[PDB]
Design an enzyme around this catalytic site. Structure first.
Site, PDB file in Angstrom:
ATOM      1  CD  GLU A 298      -2.341  -1.769   0.310  1.00 46.83           C
ATOM      2  OE1 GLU A 298      -2.907  -0.891  -0.495  1.00 46.83           O
ATOM      3  OE2 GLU A 298      -2.574  -2.957   0.110  1.00 46.83           O
ATOM      4  CG  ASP A 340      38.327  22.106 -16.836  1.00 48.52           C
ATOM      5  OD1 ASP A 340      39.480  21.610 -17.086  1.00 48.52           O
ATOM      6  OD2 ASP A 340      38.186  23.262 -17.209  1.00 48.52           O
ATOM      7  CG  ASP A 608      33.527  26.082 -11.751  1.00 47.07           C
ATOM      8  OD1 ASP A 608      34.164  25.529 -12.573  1.00 47.07           O
ATOM      9  OD2 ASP A 608      34.127  26.372 -10.669  1.00 47.07           O
ATOM     10  CG  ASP A 612      32.092  24.417 -18.157  1.00 46.39           C
ATOM     11  OD1 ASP A 612      32.444  23.751 -19.280  1.00 46.39           O
ATOM     12  OD2 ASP A 612      32.991  24.681 -17.289  1.00 46.39           O
ATOM     13  CG  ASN A 676       2.173 -13.494   3.250  1.00 45.28           C
ATOM     14  OD1 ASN A 676       3.278 -14.188   3.616  1.00 45.28           O
ATOM     15  ND2 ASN A 676       1.766 -12.333   3.985  1.00 45.28           N
ATOM     16  CG  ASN A 701       0.220  -6.325   2.535  1.00 45.58           C
ATOM     17  OD1 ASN A 701       0.444  -7.122   2.991  1.00 45.58           O
ATOM     18  ND2 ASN A 701      -0.136  -6.345   1.241  1.00 45.58           N
TER      19      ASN A 701
HETATM   20 MG   LIG Z   1       4.158 -14.598   5.232  1.00 47.69          MG
END
Ligand SMILES: [Mg+2]
Length: 859
Positions: A298, A340, A608, A612, A676, A701
């Site tokens: 979930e 650079d 920088d 660039d 599960n 869950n």
């Molecule tokens: Mg289980």
């Protein structure tokens, strides 16, 4: 395209330039304020920078189209249909929280990525009248203010703002790949040199809006504006502007797609086995709902976004200010770094070493010549000028200052790459001193002083000077040649043309000591799998020598001239096996980064510089610095505080930790959910009733994900963050296949224990059985986290962080104590007899020991 508009362009291209001024009511000097206003009022206005904004209601839909929310909505609606209001409401709340979180994140992304082109900072160079008295000049006005019949000047890298007619052009090239479909640039001349007419798009004297100028300079006149442009609208990006979503949301989407794939092949199978064996197809569809909701985390987006957000927050304390959430994902997985040399390998402090002449002998008169140029300059403060100023002695400096007086100065320009200062010791003659890059110095020098003697500068001297400065560069020494000239005193102003037939007194040499921190940083960057590449615009000799001190293996060098001849694929192949690129233009850097991107490596560029920024835009991740130019910062993806490879290395390590946690949670939850679901499938046929109801699975869950909220705070083993983090469902699928059935075995044991020992073998007493498998399922899911988080031993060789260990205890307590609560009645759970708990403990202990033992069978 309308045929009527396809002839006016051809007529204008073939029209004489003499009659073009009167047709558009334009003057060679330019357009005044009144003329521009009248043209704007009559013809209209050009394409405004403003675009259609995304409505709040419209943005919510694109914020909802992702597959996870669609699946969650389908499950919620189905649960509503089968008389289950509580589960449907919880799913609706989860999907609403997901939508709001995606909304805030997408607003942040739109702030970071408004559009492909800003279209606002782009301006145009027009003549106009600055002084309003005919003096005119050069102005930077928005393209929307460009009225028809306006004289504009074009330069390299400037996109065409509107349709223009070339009045004057000097080697002007325009890339018309958008309009004509040809990537090769087409030369544009002042006069139409094409023999055949009737091709408005192929006309060499006409430039259309939407195209850029590859190289050269030109001065054209605007002919169309607004809707009159051949491009038409060129701004109707009202919807679907951000067609490509974040790589982060793409990762969540593909993870959800894997689970959807598993549902679509497992839920029908359960529907068949239980539904044909029993015949109650309503309960069969209820089984299908149970298996579909069994494997669907979930809060998967919530947990993943929380992990990335915590990574971004803890990077902020490591001097790595990350702009976007997605940037961390590419930062962890990055394996090639292109930087650079100046400021990263070598500290920007620039000391001065040596005073050599053309002969290479240590001459102090070269220092006298150089000192005046630095001292008598009134331009911008130069650190090199202060260095050479400090180089000289105080007494000689005072004597030179008293002897000489400043007369004129030539500002430094990129066209000549030199600056000159005119000084005079008397009113009879003036001395001009120029310094700059070596080649430009010999280009303007015809004579040199050899051993204090004036000699004509012939080819042998050029070769010997080239050899001596080659030796200096191989040492690692930035050479700057100084030139002097004697001219008679005059009242005129010296210009760039005066720098001719100068005498090259000598050359001054400067060196950058590599950073003390950079050697271990570069040693460690290879220990993280990151291959460091140098894309430097300096000389190949200097960069090659620099790479030696730091420890980087230069090997064979690549010059930017060679890469021009190569095509895309061969250049990519060359760049794969080479480390250093020298003498590079910004387009070369962009092309090399794009070619490195192809094979799959996540290449990051660090820069920088003013030019660039496009390299930062092209790369998978653009790293800039807060002290850089503003445009580069706005075009970056991570703005670290200061230039240092140690800071970047620590940032990469942390960005790998954040990825390891975010992927580890995904793998854990996927494997447990698949276990599960498999258990539900295998026991679907034999049980006359549901093993566990959807309301039971959904709450399990939710509680497990609540226990998964502490995952971003987990302690990642150093094994995980030792290599670039790759995200592919190929290994997630096989992890699920391996680690599901291990859980399913003990879930089958729980089924048998309920069916026989506790006599919950009748649909009238399914609640005890259903309630019973819930407690063990919810406990084992959270307990298996500590076993399967680490490849090494579960508690004595690799432990877990306190938040994770704690939240596990809290969720265990909630799960055990949930049946013994008033909430049991509304959750369709009931109390469990005390004889259950020893069996629960035995099952959990067995599952732990078994899973830890099997764990070694992944490899
Ligand atoms: Mg289980």
């Amino acid at each position: 395209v309308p045929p009527s508009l396809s002839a006016h362009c051809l007529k204008m291209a073939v029209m004489p330039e003499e009659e073009l001024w009167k047709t558009f009511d334009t003057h060679p000097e330019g357009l005044n304020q009144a003329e521009v206003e009248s043209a704007r009022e009559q013809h209209g206005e050009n394409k405004l920078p403003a675009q259609q904004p995304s409505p709040w209601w419209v943005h919510l839909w694109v914020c909802y189209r992702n597959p996870f929310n669609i699946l969650l909505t389908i499950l919620g609606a189905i649960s509503y249909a089968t008389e289950d209001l509580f589960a449907a409401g919880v799913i609706a709340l989860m999907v609403a929280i997901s939508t709001l979180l995606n909304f805030i994140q997408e607003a942040r992304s739109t702030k970071a990525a408004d559009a492909l082109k800003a279209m606002v900072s782009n301006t145009a160079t027009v003549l106009r009248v600055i002084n309003d008295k005919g003096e005119n000049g050069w102005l930077e006005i928005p393209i929307d203010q460009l009225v028809p019949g306006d004289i504009i000047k074009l330069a390299a890298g400037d996109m065409i703002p509107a349709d223009l007619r070339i009045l004057q052009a000097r080697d002007l090239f325009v890339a018309q790949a958008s309009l004509t479909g040809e990537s090769l640039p087409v030369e544009k001349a002042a006069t139409t040199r094409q023999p055949e007419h009737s091709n408005p798009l192929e006309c060499d004297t006409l430039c259309f809006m939407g195209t850029t100028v590859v190289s050269g300079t030109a001065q054209a006149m605007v002919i169309a504006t607004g809707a009159n442009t051949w491009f038409g609208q060129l701004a109707g990006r009202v919807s679907e502007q951000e067609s490509e979503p974040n790589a982060f949301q793409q990762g969540i989407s593909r993870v959800s797609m894997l689970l959807i794939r598993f549902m679509l092949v497992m839920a029908p199978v359960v529907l068949l086995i239980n539904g044909y064996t029993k015949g109650d197809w309503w309960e069969a569809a209820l089984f299908a709902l149970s298996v579909a909701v069994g494997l669907t985390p979930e809060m998967l987006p919530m947990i993943v976004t929380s992990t990335l957000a915590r990574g971004a927050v803890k990077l902020s304390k490591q001097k790595v200010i990350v702009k976007h959430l997605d940037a961390i994902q590419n930062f962890g997985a990055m394996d090639i770094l292109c930087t650079d040399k100046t400021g990263t390998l070598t500290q920007d402090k620039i000391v001065l070493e040596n005073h050599t002449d053309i002969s290479g002998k240590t001459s102090e008169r070269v220092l006298h010549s150089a000192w005046l140029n630095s001292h008598y300059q009134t331009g911008l403060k130069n650190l090199l000028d202060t260095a050479v100023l400090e180089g000289t002695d105080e007494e000689s400096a005072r004597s030179l200052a008293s002897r000489w007086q400043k007369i004129d100065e030539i500002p430094f320009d990129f066209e000549r790459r030199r600056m000159s200062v005119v000084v005079a010791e008397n009113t009879e003659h003036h001395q001009l001193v120029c310094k700059g890059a070596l080649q430009e110095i010999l280009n303007v020098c015809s004579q040199v002083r050899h051993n204090g003697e004036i000699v004509p500068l012939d080819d042998i001297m050029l070769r010997k000077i080239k050899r001596v400065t080659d030796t200096l560069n191989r040492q690692g020494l930035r050479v700057v040649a100084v030139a002097t000239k004697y001219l008679p005193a005059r009242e005129g102003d010296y210009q760039r043309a005066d720098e001719s037939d100068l005498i090259l007194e000598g050359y001054i040499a400067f060196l950058d000591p590599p950073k003390e921190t950079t050697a271990p940083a570069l040693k460690a960057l290879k220990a993280s799998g990151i291959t460091v590449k140098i894309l430097t615009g300096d000389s190949e000799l200097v960069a090659a020598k620099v790479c030696h001190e730091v420890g980087l293996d230069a090997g064979e060098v690549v010059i930017g001239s060679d890469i021009e001849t190569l095509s895309d694929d061969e250049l990519a192949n060359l760049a794969q096996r080479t480390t250093l690129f020298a003498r590079l233009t910004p387009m070369h850097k962009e092309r090399i980064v794009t070619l490195l991107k192809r094979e799959g490596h996540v290449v990051g560029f660090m820069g920088d510089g003013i030019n660039d920024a496009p390299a930062l835009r092209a790369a998978d991740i653009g790293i800039s610095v807060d002290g850089a130019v503003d445009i580069a910062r706005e075009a970056a993806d991570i703005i670290l505080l200061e230039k240092s490879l140690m800071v970047l290395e620590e940032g990469v390590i942390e960005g790998r930790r954040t990825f390891a946690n975010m992927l580890k949670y995904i793998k854990m939850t996927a494997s447990s959910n698949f276990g599960n679901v498999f258990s539900v499938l295998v026991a679907s046929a034999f049980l006359p009733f549901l093993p566990m109801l959807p309301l039971h699975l959904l709450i399990q869950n939710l509680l497990y994900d609540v226990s998964q909220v502490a995952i971003p705070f987990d302690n990642v083993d150093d094994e995980q963050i030792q290599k670039p983090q790759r995200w592919n469902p190929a290994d997630l699928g096989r992890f699920m296949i391996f680690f599901g059935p291990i859980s399913s075995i003990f879930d089958i044991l729980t089924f048998c224990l309920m069916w026989w020992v506790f006599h919950a073998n009748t649909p009238e007493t399914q609640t005890l059985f259903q309630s019973g498998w819930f407690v063990v399922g919810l406990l084992s899911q959270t307990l298996i986290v500590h076993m399967i988080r680490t490849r090494r031993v579960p508690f004595i060789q690799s432990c877990a962080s306190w938040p994770l260990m704690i939240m596990t205890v809290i969720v265990m307590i909630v799960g055990i104590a949930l049946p013994f609560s008033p909430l049991a009645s509304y959750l369709q759970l009931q109390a469990l007899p005390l004889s259950y708990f020893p069996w629960l403990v035995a099952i959990l202990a067995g599952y732990m020991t078994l899973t830890q033992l099997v764990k070694g069978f992944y490899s």
